[PDB]
Enzyme design. Structure first.
Site, short mmCIF file in Angstrom:
data_model
loop_
_atom_site.label_atom_id
_atom_site.label_comp_id
_atom_site.label_asym_id
_atom_site.label_seq_id
_atom_site.Cartn_x
_atom_site.Cartn_y
_atom_site.Cartn_z
CG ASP A 282 -1.92 1.14 1.18
OD1 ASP A 282 -2.44 1.47 2.24
OD2 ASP A 282 -2.19 1.76 0.11
CG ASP B 174 -3.65 4.61 -2.69
OD1 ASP B 174 -2.98 3.63 -2.27
OD2 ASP B 174 -4.71 5.00 -2.16
C1 LIG Z 1 -9.56 1.93 -0.51
C2 LIG Z 1 -8.58 2.24 0.59
O1 LIG Z 1 -8.87 2.84 1.64
N1 LIG Z 1 -7.34 1.77 0.40
C3 LIG Z 1 -6.37 1.89 1.46
C4 LIG Z 1 -5.66 0.55 1.75
C5 LIG Z 1 -6.74 -0.48 2.12
C6 LIG Z 1 -6.89 -1.62 1.32
C7 LIG Z 1 -7.88 -2.56 1.60
F1 LIG Z 1 -8.03 -3.65 0.83
C8 LIG Z 1 -8.72 -2.39 2.67
C9 LIG Z 1 -8.58 -1.25 3.44
F2 LIG Z 1 -9.42 -1.12 4.45
C10 LIG Z 1 -7.58 -0.29 3.22
C11 LIG Z 1 -5.41 2.99 1.03
O2 LIG Z 1 -4.36 3.05 1.98
C12 LIG Z 1 -6.09 4.32 0.86
N2 LIG Z 1 -5.06 5.35 0.62
C13 LIG Z 1 -5.41 6.73 0.90
C14 LIG Z 1 -6.35 7.17 -0.22
C15 LIG Z 1 -7.02 8.50 0.07
C16 LIG Z 1 -6.09 9.70 0.19
C17 LIG Z 1 -6.84 10.98 0.52
C18 LIG Z 1 -6.45 10.70 -0.92
O3 LIG Z 1 -7.78 8.35 1.26
C19 LIG Z 1 -7.26 7.83 2.41
C20 LIG Z 1 -7.85 8.06 3.69
C21 LIG Z 1 -7.22 7.46 4.80
C22 LIG Z 1 -6.04 6.70 4.65
C23 LIG Z 1 -5.29 6.01 5.80
C24 LIG Z 1 -4.42 6.93 6.67
C25 LIG Z 1 -5.16 8.19 7.11
C26 LIG Z 1 -4.03 6.15 7.95
C27 LIG Z 1 -3.20 7.34 5.85
C28 LIG Z 1 -5.50 6.45 3.40
C29 LIG Z 1 -6.04 6.98 2.25
#
Ligand SMILES: CC(=O)N[C@@H](Cc1cc(F)cc(F)c1)[C@H](O)CN[C@H]1C[C@H](C2CC2)Oc2ccc(CC(C)(C)C)cc21
EC number: 3.4.23.46
Length: 382
Positions: free
Chosen positions: A36, A225
């Site tokens: 990730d 991402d």
């Molecule tokens: C679909 C998904 O959530 N994928 C996750 C990984 C993921 C994969 C999965 F199969 C199940 C999950 F529950 C989580 C990504 O890691 C998303 N990456 C960014 C995308 C986008 C960013 C804003 C553009 O929004 C957020 C919001 C929160 C977070 C986590 C942290 C706050 C701790 C960093 C990450 C992100």
């Protein structure tokens, strides 16, 4: 060196992310770990859960150290909580090293593990700035570079589909494997080290410019991402793109819900009308001032093959472009068929056409430039 040993070290089910094998603890416990670039925590299931085939057993590891604090991490829709600790970790088809790394032991979760998934944990490869509880929780890859002396770089070659469809690819840790791409690698600056933030300077649909103030493309950020599936686009950009693709493909008419990602469109097998769907070009800011380069997306990448086992003969697809209110995400669907270099040491991300790409009879995914531009640093949001 050669990275021959790391080729094909990634697996996955379509839409459920790519994972690499890892070991945690002494003696090593093997787990499959989601890769990730969109988060910064290394976390593994460490208590039974109905969708986990295995989970980490701290008590069976002579090297576990509990940090006596908890941690909660919410993603876009799933979340977990757990106890923090450290243990020895390695990657059996990555470099032959062992690092002492922070590990979140997931002991409860919500909408995180997926039924049938094959992975048991997640490896956030982005920067300390976005780590939970805060930035003093050193991410796995920082530990690896600090402790073993691997160059500060990894690259990802996500290959897409070769029962939901199996996927694979390669994660080269510590360098660039020249046999996994063709042509020239083009770099875009990492704007800010938190997510892997980049800047898009222009969008074309079938060569036709979307003609938006380029700030709208990065409102309020754009990231690369591997942990998100779709291309995700801010409100206004999404609507303009969905309009452009509707018009170039207007010969056939599709449900509201198709374009909302709610419904499949199906075609009798072998009849998918690829050619009515446009290609999409995202130009990204170059390293040289006033230069850009573009990457080009085929419909085979933004219409995800998804099977109905009932109407079993058809070819069905979900629309893998979708609406965001948190900025652009260049997810798996965009990275597949390209070779992507997270050049952390030089604060840049490179793209090149992958050895495993998605060619068509008439059209081909490409990475091309230079194209001369202006006010490209203006395309960033504040
Ligand atoms: C679909 C998904 O959530 N994928 C996750 C990984 C993921 C994969 C999965 F199969 C199940 C999950 F529950 C989580 C990504 O890691 C998303 N990456 C960014 C995308 C986008 C960013 C804003 C553009 O929004 C957020 C919001 C929160 C977070 C986590 C942290 C706050 C701790 C960093 C990450 C992100």
């Amino acid at each position: 060196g050669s990275f021959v040993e790391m080729v094909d070290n990634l697996r996955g089910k379509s839409g459920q992310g790519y994972y690499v094998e890892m070991t945690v603890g002494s003696p090593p416990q093997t787990l499959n770990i989601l890769v990730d670039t969109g988060s910064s925590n290394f976390a593994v299931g460490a208590a039974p859960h109905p969708f986990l085939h295995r989970y980490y057993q701290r008590q069976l590891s002579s090297t576990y150290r509990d940090l006596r604090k908890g941690v909660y991490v919410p993603y876009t829709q799933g979340a977990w909580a757990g106890e923090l600790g450290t243990d020895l970790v390695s990657i059996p088809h990555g470099p032959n090293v062992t690092v002492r790394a922070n590990i979140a032991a997931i002991t409860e979760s919500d909408k995180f593990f997926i039924n049938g998934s094959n992975w048991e944990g997640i490896l956030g490869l982005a920067y300390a700035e976005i780590a939970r509880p805060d930035d003093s929780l050193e991410p796995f890859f920082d530990s690896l570079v600090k402790q073993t002396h691997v160059p500060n770089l990894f690259s990802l070659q996500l290959c897409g589909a070769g029962v939901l469809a199996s996927v694979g690819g390669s994660m080269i840790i510590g360098g660039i494997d020249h046999s996994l791409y063709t042509g020239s690698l083009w770099y875009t600056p990492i704007r800010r080290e938190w997510y892997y933030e980049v800047i898009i300077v222009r969008v074309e649909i079938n060569g036709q410019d979307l003609k938006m103030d380029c700030k709208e493309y990065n409102y309020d950020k754009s990231i690369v991402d591997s942990g998100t599936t779709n291309l995700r686009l801010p409100k206004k950009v999404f609507e303009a793109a969905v309009k452009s693709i509707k018009a170039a493909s207007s010969t056939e008419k599709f449900p509201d819900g198709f374009w909302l990602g709610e419904q499949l469109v199906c075609w009798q097998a072998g009849t998918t009308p690829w050619n009515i769907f446009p290609v999409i070009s995202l130009y990204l800011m170059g390293e040289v001032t006033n230069q850009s380069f573009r990457i080009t997306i085929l419909p085979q990448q933004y219409l995800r093959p998804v099977e109905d086992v009932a109407t079993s003969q058809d070819d069905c697809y979900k629309f893998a472009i979708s609406q965001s209110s948190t900025g652009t995400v260049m997810g798996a669907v965009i990275m597949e068929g390209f070779y992507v270099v997270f050049d952390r040491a030089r604060k840049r991300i490179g793209f090149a056409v992958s050895a495993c790409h998605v060619h068509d009879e008439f059209r081909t995914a490409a990475v091309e430039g230079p194209f001369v531009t202006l006010d490209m640093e203006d395309c960033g949001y504040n």
